[PDB]
Design an enzyme around this catalytic site. Structure first.
Site, mmCIF file in Angstrom:
data_model
loop_
_atom_site.group_PDB
_atom_site.id
_atom_site.type_symbol
_atom_site.label_atom_id
_atom_site.label_comp_id
_atom_site.label_asym_id
_atom_site.label_seq_id
_atom_site.Cartn_x
_atom_site.Cartn_y
_atom_site.Cartn_z
ATOM 1 N N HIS A 277 -3.983 -4.451 -49.746
ATOM 2 C CA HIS A 277 -3.258 -5.717 -49.595
ATOM 3 C C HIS A 277 -2.770 -6.334 -50.890
ATOM 4 O O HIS A 277 -3.241 -5.995 -51.983
ATOM 5 C CB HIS A 277 -4.133 -6.781 -48.923
ATOM 6 C CG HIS A 277 -5.180 -6.234 -48.008
ATOM 7 N ND1 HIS A 277 -6.523 -6.230 -48.329
ATOM 8 C CD2 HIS A 277 -5.092 -5.696 -46.768
ATOM 9 C CE1 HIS A 277 -7.211 -5.720 -47.329
ATOM 10 N NE2 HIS A 277 -6.366 -5.386 -46.366
ATOM 11 N N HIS B 79 -2.809 -9.599 -52.941
ATOM 12 C CA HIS B 79 -3.534 -10.853 -53.041
ATOM 13 C C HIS B 79 -2.664 -11.851 -53.790
ATOM 14 O O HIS B 79 -1.845 -11.468 -54.622
ATOM 15 C CB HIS B 79 -4.877 -10.646 -53.743
ATOM 16 C CG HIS B 79 -5.896 -9.955 -52.886
ATOM 17 N ND1 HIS B 79 -7.164 -10.450 -52.696
ATOM 18 C CD2 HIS B 79 -5.815 -8.820 -52.150
ATOM 19 C CE1 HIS B 79 -7.829 -9.652 -51.874
ATOM 20 N NE2 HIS B 79 -7.031 -8.656 -51.529
ATOM 21 N N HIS C 13 -5.857 -12.968 -49.776
ATOM 22 C CA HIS C 13 -4.629 -12.274 -49.418
ATOM 23 C C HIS C 13 -3.452 -13.248 -49.519
ATOM 24 O O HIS C 13 -3.585 -14.428 -49.185
ATOM 25 C CB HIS C 13 -4.724 -11.731 -47.982
ATOM 26 C CG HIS C 13 -5.798 -10.707 -47.794
ATOM 27 N ND1 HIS C 13 -6.031 -10.084 -46.581
ATOM 28 C CD2 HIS C 13 -6.715 -10.199 -48.648
ATOM 29 C CE1 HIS C 13 -7.038 -9.247 -46.702
ATOM 30 N NE2 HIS C 13 -7.476 -9.295 -47.951
ATOM 31 N N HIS D 291 -5.422 -13.185 -40.841
ATOM 32 C CA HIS D 291 -5.315 -11.799 -41.278
ATOM 33 C C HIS D 291 -4.997 -10.904 -40.086
ATOM 34 O O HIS D 291 -5.406 -11.190 -38.963
ATOM 35 C CB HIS D 291 -6.629 -11.340 -41.917
ATOM 36 C CG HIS D 291 -6.625 -9.902 -42.331
ATOM 37 N ND1 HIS D 291 -5.862 -9.431 -43.374
ATOM 38 C CD2 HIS D 291 -7.270 -8.828 -41.816
ATOM 39 C CE1 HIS D 291 -6.035 -8.125 -43.489
ATOM 40 N NE2 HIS D 291 -6.884 -7.735 -42.556
ATOM 41 N N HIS E 87 -1.047 -11.947 -42.683
ATOM 42 C CA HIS E 87 -0.791 -12.470 -44.017
ATOM 43 C C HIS E 87 0.378 -11.666 -44.555
ATOM 44 O O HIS E 87 0.506 -10.479 -44.249
ATOM 45 C CB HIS E 87 -2.006 -12.245 -44.923
ATOM 46 C CG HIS E 87 -3.245 -12.967 -44.478
ATOM 47 N ND1 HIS E 87 -4.503 -12.465 -44.677
ATOM 48 C CD2 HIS E 87 -3.394 -14.172 -43.879
ATOM 49 C CE1 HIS E 87 -5.397 -13.335 -44.219
ATOM 50 N NE2 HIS E 87 -4.750 -14.372 -43.735
ATOM 51 N N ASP F 3 -0.728 -8.428 -46.076
ATOM 52 C CA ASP F 3 -1.451 -7.411 -45.303
ATOM 53 C C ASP F 3 -0.701 -6.093 -45.108
ATOM 54 O O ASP F 3 0.204 -6.001 -44.278
ATOM 55 C CB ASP F 3 -1.853 -7.962 -43.927
ATOM 56 C CG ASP F 3 -2.821 -9.129 -44.019
ATOM 57 O OD1 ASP F 3 -3.584 -9.216 -45.008
ATOM 58 O OD2 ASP F 3 -2.834 -9.957 -43.081
ATOM 59 N N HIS G 92 -9.315 -1.498 -51.266
ATOM 60 C CA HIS G 92 -10.702 -1.805 -50.926
ATOM 61 C C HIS G 92 -11.725 -0.693 -50.697
ATOM 62 O O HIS G 92 -11.394 0.470 -50.485
ATOM 63 C CB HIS G 92 -10.721 -2.718 -49.700
ATOM 64 C CG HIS G 92 -10.260 -4.110 -49.982
ATOM 65 N ND1 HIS G 92 -11.125 -5.120 -50.347
ATOM 66 C CD2 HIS G 92 -9.023 -4.660 -49.973
ATOM 67 C CE1 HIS G 92 -10.441 -6.229 -50.549
ATOM 68 N NE2 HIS G 92 -9.162 -5.979 -50.330
ATOM 69 N N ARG H 256 -13.471 -5.031 -53.897
ATOM 70 C CA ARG H 256 -12.206 -4.601 -54.474
ATOM 71 C C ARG H 256 -12.482 -3.522 -55.514
ATOM 72 O O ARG H 256 -12.994 -3.810 -56.591
ATOM 73 C CB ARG H 256 -11.511 -5.813 -55.096
ATOM 74 C CG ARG H 256 -11.454 -6.988 -54.123
ATOM 75 C CD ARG H 256 -10.873 -8.265 -54.719
ATOM 76 N NE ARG H 256 -10.942 -9.337 -53.731
ATOM 77 C CZ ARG H 256 -10.484 -10.573 -53.902
ATOM 78 N NH1 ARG H 256 -9.891 -10.926 -55.039
ATOM 79 N NH2 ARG H 256 -10.615 -11.457 -52.920
HETATM 80 CU CU LIG Z 1 -7.367 -7.092 -50.103
HETATM 81 ZN ZN LIG Z 2 -4.999 -10.478 -44.896
#
Ligand SMILES: [Cu+]
Ligand SMILES: [Zn+2]
Ligand SMILES: [Cu+]
Ligand SMILES: [Zn+2]
Lengths: 153, 153
Positions: free
Chosen positions: B46, B48, B63, B71, B80, B83, B120, B143
């Site tokens: 994603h 951020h 995010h 999300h 998001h 995403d 992730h 992360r």
């Molecule tokens: Cu993320």
């Molecule tokens: Zn998200």
């Protein structure tokens, strides 16, 4: 954005965090932070065109120059948008950066967001060197450390 | 910008290079590249909100969510802006990325330029986990690697 930041890293000991803050969407941008591991004295300090770190600081390209002008010092009318001049490292190798500039911006056409902040090996002659290189890079030498300028809070 | 790039780095072995290209400002964005050092299987991917690496990937914030939604998966109406779902690492720990998304953009008031791309530890449940954490992060875990999205040539 109203705040931005860049984490400087290179192949040597030069490292640091530089913050950018723009109170008004068009007003001056304040630049401050600390850089350590530098030799005492002047060091070129500019925003380069690309936020590409695929090949170290080398892939950041030339100085951010959207108006296609010649290299200069930050006080000059004739300069690249990314020309922030020099920063000074003390006897301990620390540069406590404090700059204010009205040409770079954190939004719009002259935004430095997503571009690369670079600190150099030598002093930037601010375009007063008399050779072609002076009007391009200020003869600041190699790129010791760099980082992509990102949106902050 | 029409092109962008992010170099992913973290405290572990996870690293990679992700390219972004948008042919037209109102067109979709193609995302491609590769990430290595991952455990075989799915891994959250994603954008951020902040391009702040001062505390590693930890300072990137949540995010990117300018529309203030829950999300979800990249193909969910409710999601998001940042995403991008999951990338898949093969048995050799390599995830070859090839994505096209029409929600994220490389320009405009909601550009992802200057923000952070994160990969992730665990898989993104795309917001169907049934718990509050699922509607925030999708239970993707820590992360592993990240990089500021910068303008590229
Ligand atoms: Cu993320
Ligand atoms: Zn998200
Ligand atoms: Cu420079
Ligand atoms: Zn210049």
């Amino acid at each position: 954005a109203t705040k931005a930041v860049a984490v400087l890293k290179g192949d040597g000991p030069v490292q640091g965090i530089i913050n950018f803050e723009q109170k008004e969407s068009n007003g001056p941008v304040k630049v401050w932070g600390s850089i350590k591991g530098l030799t005492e004295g002047l060091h070129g300090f500019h925003v380069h065109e690309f936020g590409d770190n695929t090949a170290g600081c080398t892939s950041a390209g030339p100085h951010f120059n959207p108006l296609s002008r010649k290299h200069g010092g930050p006080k000059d009318e004739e300069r690249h948008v990314g020309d922030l001049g020099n920063v000074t490292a003390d006897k301990d190798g620390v540069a406590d950066v404090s700059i204010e500039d009205s040409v770079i911006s954190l939004s719009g056409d002259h935004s430095i967001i997503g571009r690369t902040l670079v600190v150099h090996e030598k002093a930037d002659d601010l375009g007063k060197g008399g050779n072609e290189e002076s009007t391009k890079t200020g003869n600041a030498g190699s790129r010791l450390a760099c980082g992509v300028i990102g949106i902050a809070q």
